[PDB]
Amino acid sequence: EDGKPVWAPHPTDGFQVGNIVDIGPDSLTIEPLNQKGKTFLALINQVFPAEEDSKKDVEDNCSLMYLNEATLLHNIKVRYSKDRIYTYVANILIAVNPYFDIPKIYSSETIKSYQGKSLGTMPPHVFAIADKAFRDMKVLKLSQSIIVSGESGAGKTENTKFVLRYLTESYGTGQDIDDRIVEANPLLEAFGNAKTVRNNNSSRFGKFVEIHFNEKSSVVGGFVSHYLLEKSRICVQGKEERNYHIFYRLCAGASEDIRERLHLSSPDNFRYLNRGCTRYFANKETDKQILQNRKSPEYLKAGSLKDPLLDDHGDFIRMCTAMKKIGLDDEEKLDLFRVVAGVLHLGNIDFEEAGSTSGGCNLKNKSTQALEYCAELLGLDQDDLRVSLTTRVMLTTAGGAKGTVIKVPLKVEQANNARDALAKTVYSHLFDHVVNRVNQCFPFETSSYFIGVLDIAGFEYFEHNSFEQFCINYCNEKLQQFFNERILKEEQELYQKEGLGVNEVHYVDNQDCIDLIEARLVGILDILDEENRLPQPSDQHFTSAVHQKHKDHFRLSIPRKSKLAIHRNIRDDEGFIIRHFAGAVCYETTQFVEKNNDALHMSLESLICESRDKFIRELFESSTNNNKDTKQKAGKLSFISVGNKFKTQLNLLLDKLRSTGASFIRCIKPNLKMTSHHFEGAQILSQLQCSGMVSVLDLMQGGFPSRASFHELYNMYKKYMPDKLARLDPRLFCKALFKALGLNEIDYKFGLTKVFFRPGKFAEFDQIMKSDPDHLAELVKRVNHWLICSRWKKVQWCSLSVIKLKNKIKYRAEACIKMQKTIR
Amino acid sequence: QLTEEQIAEFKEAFSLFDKDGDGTITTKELGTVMRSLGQNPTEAELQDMINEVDADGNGTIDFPEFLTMMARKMKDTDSEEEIREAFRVFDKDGNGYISAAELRHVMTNLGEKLTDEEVDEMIREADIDGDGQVNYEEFVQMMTA
Amino acid sequence: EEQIAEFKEAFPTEAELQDMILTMMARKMKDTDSEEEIREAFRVFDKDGNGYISAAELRHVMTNLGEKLTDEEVDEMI
Ligand SMILES: [Ca+2]
Ligand SMILES: [Ca+2]
Ligand SMILES: [Ca+2]
Ligand SMILES: [Ca+2]
């Protein structure tokens, strides 16, 4: 602005108040308020205009005169300190987790309060999002989807319970679907959740809870769709991380009878567990309940993993209690555990080079127990599994030429991949089964529409990033195109309903970034598939190929061109940086080709499909009838990489989203310690960036990001007007004030219910009201005739309106009292 | 079809129906304005004419719907008879003039707060010939503006 | 006519059918609406449509206001 205070970076609060004392090429120098002297530099695009009153809050962030990341953070902060956890940005909701039971807002009297009442007429609340989706569902006859973001501990679970409980109490005959999903949650969390570096209890799949409605818009049932389960976690993890929870819960809580049947041990004894963290979650009490013959060497040395709610022993018992309460019996519980056990042993199978007989490989002697246990548990024969893990089968032809089958010995690395490929198919099919069994609790034969809450792992970047970060960030880049498209459409529809003008809005589209990754033949994904076809597949060749096919691309740059110094020694063929919506992310391409293969050859595919064990056949007995549909078509889809398989499944997610009106909730996590009344500014700011909130605040600057209803502008400025104008109703107050001042027509627009402003013009308006009281007083004197005329016509045309509605009642009732052609 | 200048004047009159400022009304709100200006429709007749324009089905009228809700196949003289009937709602005792007292009563009935001195100020601007009262001829010149 | 007293020998609104009950069918036949005049009153309850005016919707009004044709008398119509 010009001497007025600003917001600038701060390591622990995100932004702090300061003044611009000097200027520079790419940096301002800011002098704090609190330090009154300790000056620091800060990039220009990192400091922002701040509000005049630092003690005001607003229910919609568009009421603010400047709308950026810094003012948003400070608005929700003041509201958080009054217990007002909800705050809009347009139709978007922001729900900071209080970490305590806020009285009266989830009452029965509050649910009634929000029924019918549109978004903006009531205070910000999750109930209002729920009701907007219902209202749009029945009127536009369109399925809806509320997309919620936020890491673990952000309140997504509480938020989804609030939706389901609002929609059944308001628009449902009884209906206890919210209570069966929560009772069934511990079961999904076992097979679906896992410990990441940043979050102990973290969902590694896109869950889409959905309430289904009949033709008359009434709850008939429920459904839980699942997308993009992380397959790579199944076979290997980094240190500080773990496999899926089911493995450790079972290794801690199972009885000693079960432990002998499945031949379980401490997780350091299994390949699929031991490269990552081997410790159980336990407090002082639950550590006593676990036998010593389950604890790994590292659990004995370093001790337990701590968490306020996760406990592997306690969660095995809570999972068992789940199985009962849904419907699963004792036979089907041991079944799930037999396949999990069968996956663990499979991993322990190793290989060694042969005697150059088309030099394949053979099973090691130490790994004979591995094969024996794995095979009994997966219902496979020992010998047939030894042959399939070490040899493929191929035709002698490819075209329409006749060709007999042959046996091709696999190499060591080829056999490792097969072993892992079978492990990830088996676990996946087992996960699809658990989810399907949850759905059989609240089934429904037929349905018209649905309202679904959707949460999937958000955008993230660490010091070192690889193929796992690439896929999550690719999933979120496409989800941010959807977000940004729907907010743009919501804005363009709001300016037309209000009647502002043609006013076009500038919009930096992110399609060029999504094209960088998923374009056919030239995107990174197909260049990575192309490397799998060269005689010597290298990760360096893949990376060099990427840089060449995109010479001066806006989103691709070499690692050396990173603003950080940790990527200063990465060569050009050892990585690339992607300019995602939320930020630059230096990827390291090492191992990228390996992570792009999980293909299971058919001979071994057919072995598990036709297992002796009825349950394991039933995991692919959907696949007995669905291969029967494909089989030839299903063998052609086994040639796809994990990259292109990721794209395809992600595109089914987006098509489901595309055919539905979308609302958005942005669940925020105020701190890492799970405690109430502690707003960690920097952590919330980082959340706002990765959730794509900041990207949306850039978008709305293109349009009219500042708006205040007439009643809002009346409460602010009536005190500066004369007593005659203060008596007016808010709409006439604003009409007189807008005309008096004589504002530019392209900057300020008088809409239907609200006054809209271009970037930094609400501020310009506000200075006209306070900088020159004598000038303003004269401009109001000058419009006094127009106001007397305006008030005349208001009441004159209102009286003619009542007479015209009197004439409508008679005119209509003349044809409905001249209907007598029928009666007699 | 109405004029652009005729739409603007009904838009400001629509603000007296829509007091809270949400851009929308029900029969509880549009009913209370009707009752305030001498009319007395029952809670039933207005339900049928809401049901013409309301395409969404819910019970809420936006402005463009409100315009076609009162628009009808009109006779040549009907337009002028309505303008005269408006004047007569303003003129209670009925002698072709609107006094300060008579204008103040319609104002308060529609929900407009203002002093007695402010009321006289209005009457004075509309009053062309200068007898401190608004005849029909002058009532229409203000309406048109 | 000759056919009007012969058809009458063998042997119009319902609200205003009291005041009356030869000289009765005098003003009944005098103030009879045309065919094209009644075709305007058909477009009365026409929200939009294209000549039609719904089936189930054109009924709620006939039982709720005016000279209200009964709910039982309606079943003997559609
Ligand atoms: Ca209203
Ligand atoms: Ca409507
Ligand atoms: Ca008079
Ligand atoms: Ca006069």
Curated annotation (Swiss-Prot), chain A:
Annotated disulfide bonds: none
Subcellular location: Golgi apparatus, trans-Golgi network membrane; Golgi apparatus; Nucleus; Cytoplasm, Perinuclear region
Post-translational modification: Phosphorylation in the motor domain, induced by EGF, results in translocation of MYO6 from the cell surface to membrane ruffles and affects F-actin dynamics. Phosphorylated in vitro by p21-activated kinase (PAK).
A Gene Ontology molecular function term of the record: microfilament motor activity
Residue ranges occupied by any Myosin N-terminal SH3-like domain in the UniProt entry: 1-52
Domain Myosin motor: 56-770
Record-level GO BP terms: actin filament organization; actin filament-based movement; DNA damage response, signal transduction by p53 class mediator; endocytosis; inner ear auditory receptor cell differentiation; inner ear morphogenesis; intracellular protein transport; protein localization
Region of interest (Required for binding calmodulin), ranges: 781-809
Main localization, broad class: Golgi
Tissue expression: Expressed in all tissues examined including kidney cortex, intestinal mucosa, liver, lung, heart, jowl muscle, brain cortex and medulla, and in the epithelial cell line, LLC-PK1 (at protein level). In the kidney, located to the brush border of adult kidney proximal tubule cells.
Keyword tags: Actin-binding, ATP-binding, Calmodulin-binding, Cell membrane, Cell projection, Coated pit, Cytoplasm, Cytoplasmic vesicle, Endocytosis, Golgi apparatus, Hearing, Membrane, Motor protein, Myosin, Nucleotide-binding, Nucleus, Phosphoprotein, Protein transport, Transport
Binding-site list for ATP: 150-157
Function: Myosins are actin-based motor molecules with ATPase activity. Unconventional myosins serve in intracellular movements. Myosin 6 is a reverse-direction motor protein that moves towards the minus-end of actin filaments. Has slow rate of actin-activated ADP release due to weak ATP binding. Functions in a variety of intracellular processes such as vesicular membrane trafficking and cell migration. Required for the structural integrity of the Golgi apparatus via the p53-dependent pro-survival pathway.
Family, per entry: Belongs to the TRAFAC class myosin-kinesin ATPase superfamily. Myosin family.
Name of the protein this chain belongs to: Unconventional myosin-VI
Lineage of source species: Eukaryota, Metazoa, Chordata, Craniata, Vertebrata
Swiss-Prot record, chain B:
One GO cellular component term noted in the UniProt record for this chain: myelin sheath
Binding site for Ca(2+) 4: 127, 129, 131, 133, 138
Residue ranges of every copy of the EF-hand domain listed in the record: 5-40, 41-76, 78-113, 114-145
Presence of the UniProt keyword RNA-binding in the record: no
Keywords: Acetylation, Calcium, Metal-binding, Methylation, Repeat
Positions of modified residues (N6,N6,N6-trimethyllysine): 113
PROSITE patterns: EF_HAND_1 (PS00018), EF_HAND_2 (PS50222)
Residues that bind Ca(2+) 1: 18, 20, 22, 24, 29
Superkingdom of origin: Eukaryota
Molecular-function GO term, any one: disordered domain specific binding
Residues where Ca(2+) 3 binds: 91, 93, 95, 97, 102
Pfam families (UniProt xref): EF-hand_7
Binding-site list for Ca(2+) 2: 54, 56, 58, 60, 65
Additional detail: This protein has four functional calcium-binding sites.
Record's function text: Calmodulin acts as part of a calcium signal transduction pathway by mediating the control of a large number of enzymes, ion channels, aquaporins and other proteins through calcium-binding. Calcium-binding is required for the activation of calmodulin. Among the enzymes to be stimulated by the calmodulin-calcium complex are a number of protein kinases, such as myosin light-chain kinases and calmodulin-dependent protein kinase type II (CaMK2), and phosphatases.
Family: Belongs to the calmodulin family.
Protein name: Calmodulin
Taxonomic source organism: Gallus gallus (Chicken)
Record gene name: CALM
